[PDB]
A paper describes a structure:
Full length BsuDnaG was applied for crystallization trials and the structure of the RPD domain was solved. The results showed that proteolysis occurred in the crystallization drops and yielded a fragment of ~49 kDa. The crystals belonged to space group P61 with cell dimensions of a = b = 117.11 Å, c = 48.86 Å. There was one molecule per asymmetric unit. The RNA polymerase domain (RPD, residues 112–435) could be modeled in the electron density map. Superposition of RPD structure of B. subtilis against that of S. aureus, E. coli and A. aeolicus led to r.m.s.d. values of 1.31 Å, 1.80 Å and 1.73 Å, respectively. Clearly, the structure of BsuDnaG RPD shared similar overall structures with its homologs, except for a slight variation in the orientation of the C-terminal helical bundle. Structural comparison revealed that the orientation of loop1 in BsuDnaG RPD was quite different from that in ZBD/RPD of A. aeolicus; it appeared that the deletion of ZBD resulted in loop1 rotated about 25 degrees anti-clockwise. Our results show that the DnaG primase could degrade at the sites in the hinge regions.
Because DNA polymerases are incapable of initiating strand synthesis de novo, RNA primers are made by primase to prime DNA synthesis throughout replication; this priming activity is tightly coupled to the replisome by interactions with other replication partners. The DnaG primase is conserved in all bacteria and consists of three functional domains, an N-terminal zinc binding domain (ZBD), a central RNA polymerase domain (RPD) and a C-terminal helicase binding domain (HBD). Previous study indicated B. subtilis DnaG primase preferentially initiates primer synthesis at 5′-CTA-3′ sequence in template. To better understand the structure and function of primase and address the interactions between DnaG and specific DNA template, we have carried out structural and functional analysis on DnaG protein from B. subtilis (BsuDnaG).
Residue numbers in the entry: 112 to 435
The structure:
């Protein structure tokens, strides 16, 4: 009953935030800045992007005038209570507003991109009775039927990368919102598709998240591949530098196995010209190879090691047996 109040406010605010972006003077600085970073108004209306004015109480007064309890709206994640107990203010101020739809198309939260210095850069609704990030996959309600048509899903972190991908014609794109992939997410993904492509940031945190996401996904029978962004780029940086078509064609459609990805990951921080690092890398890769099913799959990757380092397969195989 109170949850229905929080839902109706979110539906209303999506329309209004969008209205302020498209139809007011204040919205201009955000609208122009959006267009200047690749947004088309086809995208703005498609994702119903909006703008929250740079005020403390504009939406607080807006909701109270319309009969909404401030404390409900605080439980909804829309307002914050003054630490000193004097009242309530707008959680989302001077941000570009991205609505977060649950898997049936109902708005349950927002993500706001700071225009300016306020922190965080990206502010998200907290846990509310409506919004549980451990079960929601951003863009899933729009992506579901593309995931089934393409027989694959492309999994990002954060909404920004998803919108760049959709723009790049990867409509089977979804993301986690401020959280690692969870078992609830894997159960939803598995019900809908077998193939999953991870496309994460290429910094050290992204690499650990890729490794962790793919262990959860493989345990449940998902066929997993890894999109690998070259240099030190995140997906959106690639899309802007080279364009959506190259991203789709040479990144998403050339994604590699989990084992091929580990074989790159395990290289970082190692000097493969140093005998100790060279050996540790090899042994680390053979330990992963030993968890693969079947000699054929194992042999495929043992052969890359034999070839890249000019080592006999006999001694790589002898070391493999140790681990198994």
């Amino acid at each position: 009953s109170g949850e229905q109040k929080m839902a109706e406010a979110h539906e209303l605010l999506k329309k209004f935030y969008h209205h302020l972006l498209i139809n007011t003077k204040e919205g201009q600085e955000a609208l122009d800045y959006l267009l200047s970073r690749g947004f088309t108004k086809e995208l703005i209306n498609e994702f119903q992007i909006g703008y929250a004015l740079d005020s403390w109480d504009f939406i607080t007064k807006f909701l109270v005038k319309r009969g909404f309890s401030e404390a409900q709206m605080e439980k909804a994640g829309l307002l914050i209570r003054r630490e000193d107990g004097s009242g309530y203010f707008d959680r989302f101020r001077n941000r570009v507003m991205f609505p977060i739809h649950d898997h049936h198309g109902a708005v349950v939260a927002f993500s706001g991109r700071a225009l300016g210095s306020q922190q965080p850069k990206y502010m998200n609704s907290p846990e509310t009775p409506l919004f549980h990030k451990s079960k929601l996959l951003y863009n899933f309600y729009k992506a579901r039927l593309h995931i089934r048509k393409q027989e694959r899903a492309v999994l990002f972190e954060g909404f920004a990368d998803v919108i760049s991908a959709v723009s790049s014609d990867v409509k089977e794109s979804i993301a986690t919102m401020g959280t690692s992939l969870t078992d609830d997410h894997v159960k939803i993904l598995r019900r809908n598709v077998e193939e999953i492509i991870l496309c994460y940031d290429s910094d050290k945190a992204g690499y650990e998240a890729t490794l962790k996401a793919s262990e959860l996904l493989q345990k449940k029978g998902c066929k997993v591949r890894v999109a690998m962004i070259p240099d030190g780029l995140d997906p959106d940086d690639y899309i802007k530098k080279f364009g959506g078509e190259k991203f789709k064609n040479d990144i998403i459609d050339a994604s590699v196995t989990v084992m091929a990805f580990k074989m790159q990951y395990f290289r970082k921080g190692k000097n493969l010209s140093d005998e100790g690092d060279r050996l540790a890398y090899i042994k680390d890769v053979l330990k992963e190879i030993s968890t693969l099913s079947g000699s054929l799959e194992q042999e495929v990757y043992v052969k890359q090691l034999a070839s890249e380092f000019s080592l006999s397969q006999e001694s790589l195989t002898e070391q493999l047996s140790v681990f198994s």
